[PDB]
Design a protein around this ligand. Structure first.
Ligand SMILES: NC1=N[C@@]2(c3ccc(F)cc3F)COCC[C@H]2CS1
Length: 394
């Protein structure tokens, strides 16, 4: 797996990408690693934010599927033509797969200016693939066509004119022991669609938020490398900000900071990290009535941003935000840990990353077990729409 170490790069807040090749001869593209979607989609037409794009015409191995694909999401949209081609990960397993590729022809607020990526690798399940669940995702094709074990793991490492460079590792088909210390704790994958999990308790500086645990998973909780922030449901976000405000009260920040629309600065190397509390998310254990906690530092949820004007100061953005689509454990969360997407055993493993950002006084932690007698079900059951109900699965 040494060949796979440091195979991820990117700019802070703009996503982690892996180099991939598509077609014959191979066209190289930088592809966003996204555990919150299930399509392999690449820029395939000019766009002002793309240096390069996939040219289907240059590939002798390209097969058109003669089917379009339209993908609107909250903040934007992408669309294109479906087809198949030969795909490889140069700094991944020494294999070539025939995979589905959505050739992006038009997009709205999808590509990020300066991100250095031209496509997306959707690593989640067939259930959330577009147009439908018959469009086999890349990982499923990789496992079906090769002898690669059904598991991948992610070590995302966090960091005037440009944004800070980030690095990381995507280990396909295994767990690399030099990327983590201590024990690996597993939480069940609730359902194979997103990488959905269950949060049973939330503590801010060791103080329980005391909400009914279904609120933490309303309407779902997912592990998403494709989202930067820790995103929390409205009521949970409000309680969290109130508690983080209380523990950091000595300093009064503008309302824009808590909304993530304004930076707060301190003289270089003088950031008072100690006034910022740790956040502990307790995840359901493999054993009924057990949980383990993942502990995140302010170094993870206060994202560093270099101000061109005040370069003599350390400036940060609050990287916890409100959600109306449930909890999103984005890169802010993942950056503290080595995360194991054990699809074969339908579970997600967390261990302390060998690369997380920390101080001499506190560390990001993975600790357990924590036991609860007569535990209520913390999972939320999404209201069934007539549309979802009508669907047939053969
Ligand atoms: N995890 C996510 N993945 C998507 C995404 C990530 C990063 C990005 F830069 C653009 C995007 F469109 C791609 O799949 C559809 C939903 C959106 C938003 S959240």
């Amino acid at each position: 797996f040494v060949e796979m170490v440091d195979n991820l790069r990117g700019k802070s807040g703009q996503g982690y990408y892996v180099e991939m090749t598509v077609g014959s001869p191979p066209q190289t593209l930088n592809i966003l690693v996204d555990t919150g979607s299930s399509n392999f989609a690449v820029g395939a037409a000019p766009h002002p934010f793309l240096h390069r794009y996939y040219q289907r015409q240059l590939s002798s191995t390209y097969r058109d599927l003669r089917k379009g694909v339209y993908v609107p999401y909250t903040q934007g949209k992408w669309e294109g033509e479906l087809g198949t081609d030969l795909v490889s990960i140069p700094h991944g397993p020494n294999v070539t797969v025939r995979a589905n590729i959505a050739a992006i022809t038009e997009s709205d607020k999808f590509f990020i200016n300066g991100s250095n990526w031209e496509g997306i690798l959707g690593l989640a399940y067939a259930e959330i693939a577009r147009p439908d669940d018959s469009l086999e995702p890349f990982f499923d094709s990789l496992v079906k066509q090769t002898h690669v074990p059904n598991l991948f793991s992610l070590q995302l490492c966090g960091a005037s004119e440009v944004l800070a460079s980030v690095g990381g590792s995507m280990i396909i088909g295994g767990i690399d022991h030099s990327l983590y210390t201590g024990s690996l704790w597993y939480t069940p994958i609730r359902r194979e669609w997103y990488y959905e999990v269950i949060i049973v308790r939330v503590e801010i500086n060791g103080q329980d938020l005391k909400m009914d645990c279904k609120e933490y998973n309303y309407d779902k909780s997912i592990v998403d490398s494709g989202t930067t922030n820790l995103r929390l449901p409205k009521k949970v976000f409000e309680a969290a900000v109130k508690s983080i405000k209380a523990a950091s009260s000595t300093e009064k920040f503008p309302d824009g900071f808590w909304l993530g629309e304004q930076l707060v600065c301190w003289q270089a190397g003088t950031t008072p990290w100690n006034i910022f509390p740790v956040i502990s998310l307790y995840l359901m254990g493999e054993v009924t009535n057990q949980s383990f906690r993942i502990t995140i530092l302010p170094q993870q949820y206060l994202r560093p941003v270099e101000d061109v004007a005040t370069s003599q100061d350390d400036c940060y953005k609050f990287a916890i935000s409100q959600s109306s689509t449930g909890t999103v454990m984005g890169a802010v969360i993942m950056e503290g840990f080595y995360v194991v997407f054990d699809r074969a055993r339908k579970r997600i493993g967390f261990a302390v990353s060998a690369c997380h950002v920390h101080d001499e006084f506190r560390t990001a932690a993975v600790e357990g077990p924590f036991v609860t007698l007569d535990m209520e079900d913390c999972g939320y059951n999404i209201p069934q729409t007539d549309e979802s109900r009508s669907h047939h699965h053969h």
